[PDB]
Amino acid sequence: MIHELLLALSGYPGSIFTWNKRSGLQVSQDFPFLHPSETSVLNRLCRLGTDYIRFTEFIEQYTGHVQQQQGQGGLHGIYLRAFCTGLDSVLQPYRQALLDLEQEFLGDPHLSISHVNYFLDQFQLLFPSVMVVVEQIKSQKIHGCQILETVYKHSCGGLPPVRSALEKILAVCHGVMYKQLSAWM
């Protein structure tokens, strides 16, 4: 329960919020304190936080980590680097909206996860909509400028939050291709 959860949604699991690489963050399903009302509210939060654990992994694994050495295009490139910086800039809202609970879970002496579930239910909407984007990349082996079509496709999903998030990814990657075009012409 208290403050342990905020370490769990930020990417530092342990003890109660057992990380497992298959399911993600998972709560241990039998306790003397926690009544049936409430582990199933933690699983909603853990799926969002699992997608954040699963987001930080895909960011860190494709910038700074490797410099061309086989450096296969279909698993790297001047684009996939810059997607994960767009994605870093798209995760600043989540990081901000997870520091803004730190000044309450021990700055307002009682909360219940119903307020947490509500406050982060905003991000319960955005993350699977970009989780499908990186699951499209990881399965289709997208590459090069052929990621700008995937980004611009799902930027036509009508949901205004999602249509802003993938717009801010799109500005970064247009940055890159603009650089290449300033280079060539």
């Binding site: 009544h35 049936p36 009302s37 199933s40 509210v41 909603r44 799926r47 009682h110 219940s112 119903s114 307020h115 579930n117 509500y118 239910d121 905003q122 319960q124 909407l125 699977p128 499908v132 999903g157 009508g158 949901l159």
Partner: protein, 236 residues
């Protein structure tokens, strides 16, 4: 008489549970599920009330749970928290509009839970169902609107008709409340907001067509079905 075997419960525990069920959660100890119908929990009791009177006030709240367990059971599916190139742009403007209302009542059910842990003042079922009365009154509007508009649709249908029935049902639903006096000016300005979002993909598709000529009715979303353009703009 043979003794019943029964469990005492503090009424604030029952109130915590409904505030969860109505914040659209799952598997409370009270309000147990049997088959996607939410149910009372049987031999559960207090003191100032008997066993079957409590049962009957739970029934009434569980039937209100159903509406928002079912709207949540539909906000989970068509947004995917549970096909390729089948994005219904209409059921992703509806089922988004079902959501940024929900906050401003999932929330009231926090600021309620708040005085219920973080203060002294006396609260109880009779002090709180009358508190919520101007808002559960909305959810039973919202259930007839979605029951009629979407839960009545048959299993196989094309991406023209399933949007068209919903685009039609919201219009007759607001006309039913626009004319009936000022008796609840909530419900007209509840219902107008749902329609304006739900028309976004139709009113977008028409803009591309009207101003940039080409139209992108992908996944066959749109009534005028420009499958004709596939063989034409040369059969003139």
């Amino acid at each position: 008489y043979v003794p019943d075997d029964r469990v005492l419960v503090t009424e604030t525990q029952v109130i915590r549970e409904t505030l969860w069920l109505l914040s659209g959660v799952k598997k409370l100890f009270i309000f147990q599920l049997i088959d996607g119908k939410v149910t009372v929990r049987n031999n559960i009791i207090v003191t100032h009330l008997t066993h079957s009177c409590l049962r009957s006030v739970l029934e009434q709240i569980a039937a209100y749970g159903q509406v928002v367990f079912r709207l949540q059971e539909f906000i989970d599916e068509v947004m995917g928290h549970s096909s390729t190139e089948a994005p219904f742009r209409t059921y992703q403007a509806f089922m988004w509009a079902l959501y940024k209302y929900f906050i401003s009542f999932k929330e009231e059910l926090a600021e309620i839970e708040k005085c219920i842990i973080n203060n002294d003042t006396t609260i109880t079922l009779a002090i709180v169902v009358d508190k919520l009365a101007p808002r559960l009154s909305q959810l039973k509007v919202l259930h007839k609107v979605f029951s009629t508009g979407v839960a009545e649709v048959p299993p196989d249908t094309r991406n023209v008709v399933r949007a068209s029935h919903l685009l039609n049902t919201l219009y007759k639903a607001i006309l039913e409340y626009d004319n009936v006096g000022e008796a609840s000016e909530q419900t007209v300005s509840l219902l107008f907001s749902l329609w304006v979002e739900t028309v976004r993909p139709y009113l977008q598709t028409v803009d591309e067509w009207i101003v940039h000529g080409h139209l992108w009715d992908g996944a066959r979303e749109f009534i005028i079905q420009r499958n004709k353009n596939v063989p034409v703009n040369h059969r003139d």
